[PDB]
Amino acid sequence: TSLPNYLAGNGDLGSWEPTQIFAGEADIVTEGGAAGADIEIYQVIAKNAAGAMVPHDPTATEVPAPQSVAIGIAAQPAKSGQNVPYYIGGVFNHAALGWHASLDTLAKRQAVFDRTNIHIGNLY
Amino acid sequence: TSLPNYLAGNGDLGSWEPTQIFAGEADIVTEGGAAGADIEIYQVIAKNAAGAMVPHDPTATEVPAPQSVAIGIAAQPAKSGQNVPYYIGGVFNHAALGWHASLDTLAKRQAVFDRTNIHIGNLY
Amino acid sequence: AGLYTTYQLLEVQRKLKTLPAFFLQWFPRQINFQEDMIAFDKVIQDVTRV
């Protein structure tokens, strides 16, 4: 990796675009727990039948699997076999989390967390 | 009682341990409801069909009874007919709480309270 | 005595365990940086050649 580029080109150094997470003022609750799959940052997380931290996905099998009850929001990534500090309470952004498809709109993203300490609202 | 001892001997006054209960920084919510059976100190409580405070025991039914959900954590002991001031919020110890059998490992003791304000984490 | 005995307390016997610094004696320099990372450069210059 050593060639001093002699040409003439425009380019960007980067583009910073801040990721505000909190949409309210309620209290935050945290815990570390053992992972079962590969988790990104701020991805919604359930618990499988063994007690790991599998990332959240509805429609998992007839009978709903325990991967459908979403529980937490991650804070740092981990491989399968590391333990994950994850959030349990607060008020978080509608668009900073990593969801997946078929869970697009605001009504479904709040219907995931209608009951918990975690609440999801709109930034202004 | 009546006679003092003149001789030479020894003894232990006893021993004392701390029992730590809290493990985090959630808000704490309390309530006193009337109890249905004897409850020890720091025992997990359910609510039966009559609205009383039966101490928690799962596998109670082909539909499970409303004792199968756990709600509170007691703070002072009370017999049947007395009311029990219990906890609804906070973060509590894994080991100081009075569980019972078949609920011994770590993962079950959090899958009881995945959803509420109450969260049960390990002391370091 | 009677109802219960009296007591003279001596000093508290405090067994206290430490872990003294044996490995830190080779780490003299302290750097309190506010930035993110710490850059090093190592250069090896092979001269011993015919």
Automatic annotation (TrEMBL), chains A, B:
This is Putative+head+decorative+protein. InterPro entries: Head_decoration_D. The lineage of its organism: Viruses, Duplodnaviria, Heunggongvirae, Uroviricota, Caudoviricetes. The gene is YSD1_16. It comes from the Viruses. Pfam families: HDPD.
UniProtKB/TrEMBL annotation, chain C:
It is found in: Virion; Host cytoplasm. Homomultimer. Assembles to form an icosahedral capsid. The assembly is primed by the interaction between capsid assembly protease and portal dodecamer, and major capsid proteins assemble cooperatively to form the procapsid with the help of capsid scaffolding protein. Major capsid protein forms hexons and pentons of the icosahedron. Viral genomic DNA is packaged into the procapsid through the portal vertex. The packaging triggers a dramatic reconfiguration of the capsid shell. Belongs to the lambda phage major capsid protein family. This is Major capsid protein. The lineage of its organism: Viruses, Duplodnaviria, Heunggongvirae, Uroviricota, Caudoviricetes. The gene is YSD1_17. The chain holds residues 2 to 51 of 354 of the full protein.
